[PDB]
């Protein structure tokens, strides 16, 4: 049901409603998880890791964490030690201004640095299967931790940019974010019960493609099926939609890799 | 002969009182039309129990001919927005003021002349459909 709790493993506690957002106030009467959307058939299968096809692949990513790769025959446990200390909360708080960057940077363009700078090895597509698992495996170990990604100070004009993609109407059916996920969520379009359009449960594992999904390529998909031209993934606009629709769950928990359709 | 986008002859309510083709209506190809995915997709949005899974996001078109004139039935296809300003429902009859339209769902740019959602005649076609549904 919409208003029952979501508890994963029996250990950990994940909010599912929340307050909404200062910035988002005049908009929702409270921001939910996509979870609180779905049946309970599909709710029953994010609360135990062992019925979340999603978490084998973070199974495997935990051994190639371990994996030294790259001209360097380094891990990145090398440098980072067990991932469930190294990576803890980072999930929560990207995508975030990056000091040696001067920008607002992403999960999966931090990793990519340290695979050719740091490891000597190729960047993982940044959609692919490699990454994503890799990003899975980062967000299981944060979960239950509420999202904060912060959206003033050096992240401002970034998370501006975001706001105006996300009200911006695209393609030839002439549709924004906001078209489906604000003014008609919990309605339906055909037989997809329309949620919030949260990501604070990617990467997600969908029941229909039984593969993880990253942010980028969910963005990617939604403005295509506008009829439109949707940008390129890890681009400074999809960056910058990343970060405002982070921000328009926080204080939900990270939830990732989560189910849905 | 059609009257083509730039054309249309769109009173202030948005109404449009004279059809968009001189060939008649056929409302068996208007039901195939809307339950198309690729021309109308009505349906995404739009209940009509005369005829599955079909949307919330529109109201049911159940009586929508007993509670709406045929005008306004094709001035809601021709523009939604002439209609209802700042629907959701795409404007089907419209060429020019769209931000990236792609090539169907192939994510590529339409370079060149936009053709509308639909056709004259597949409009008339949904229209004559529309009102059966008395
Ligand atoms: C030492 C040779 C490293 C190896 C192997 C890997 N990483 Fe790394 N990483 C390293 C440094 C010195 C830094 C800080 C750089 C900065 O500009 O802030 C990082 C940082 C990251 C981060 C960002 C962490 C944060 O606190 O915000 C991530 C997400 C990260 N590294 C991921 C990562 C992965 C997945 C690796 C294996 C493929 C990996 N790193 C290896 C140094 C080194
Ligand atoms: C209606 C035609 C839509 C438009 C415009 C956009 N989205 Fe969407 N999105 C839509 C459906 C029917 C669904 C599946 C059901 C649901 O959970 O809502 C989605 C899903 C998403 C998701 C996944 C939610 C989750 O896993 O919990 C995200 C993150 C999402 N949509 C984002 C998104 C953005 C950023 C859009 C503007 C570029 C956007 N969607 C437009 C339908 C529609
Ligand atoms: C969702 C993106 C829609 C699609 C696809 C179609 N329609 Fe629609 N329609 C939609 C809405 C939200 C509304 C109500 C107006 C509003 O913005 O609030 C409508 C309305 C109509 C009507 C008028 C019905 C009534 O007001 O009672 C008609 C006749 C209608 N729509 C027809 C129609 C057809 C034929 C479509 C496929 C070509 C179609 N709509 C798609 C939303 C959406």
Partial sequence: ?261 | AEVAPGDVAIDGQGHVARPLTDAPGDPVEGRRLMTDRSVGNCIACHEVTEMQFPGTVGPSLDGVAARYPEAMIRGILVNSKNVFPETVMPAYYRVEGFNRPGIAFTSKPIEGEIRPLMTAGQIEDVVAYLMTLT
């Fill in chain 1, 1 to 261: 049901g919409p208003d029952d709790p979501l508890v994963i493993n029996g250990e950990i506690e994940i909010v599912t409603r929340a307050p909404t957002p200062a910035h988002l106030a005049d908009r929702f009467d409270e921001i939910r998880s996509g979870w609180t959307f779905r049946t309970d058939d599909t709710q029953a299968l994010e609360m135990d890791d062992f019925e979340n096809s999603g978490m084998v692949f973070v199974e495997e990513a935990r051994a190639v964490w371990d994996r030294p790769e790259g001209t360097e025959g380094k891990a990145c446990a090398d440098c980072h030690g067990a991932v469930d200390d190294g990576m803890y909360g980072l999930r929560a708080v990207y995508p975030k201004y990056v000091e040696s960057a001067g920008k607002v940077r992403t999960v999966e363009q931090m990793i990519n640095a340290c695979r050719t700078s740091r490891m000597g090895a190729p960047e993982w597509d940044y959609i692919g299967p490699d990454m994503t698992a890799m990003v899975a495996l980062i967000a299981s170990v944060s979960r239950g931790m509420p999202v904060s990604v912060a959206i003033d100070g050096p992240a401002q004009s970034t998370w501006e940019k975001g706001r105006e993609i996300y009200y911006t109407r695209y393609g030839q059916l002439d549709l924004s974010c906001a078209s489906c996920h604000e003014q008609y969520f919990d309605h339906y379009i055909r037989a997809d019960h329309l949620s919030q359009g949260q990501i604070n449960g990617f990467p997600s594992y969908r029941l229909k493609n039984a593969r993880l999904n990253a942010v980028h390529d969910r963005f990617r998909g939604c403005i295509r099926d506008t009829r439109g031209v949707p940008f390129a993934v890890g681009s400074p606009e999809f960056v910058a939609l990343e970060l405002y629709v982070a921000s328009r769950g926080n204080g939900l928990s990270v939830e990732g890799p989560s189910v849905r359709n």
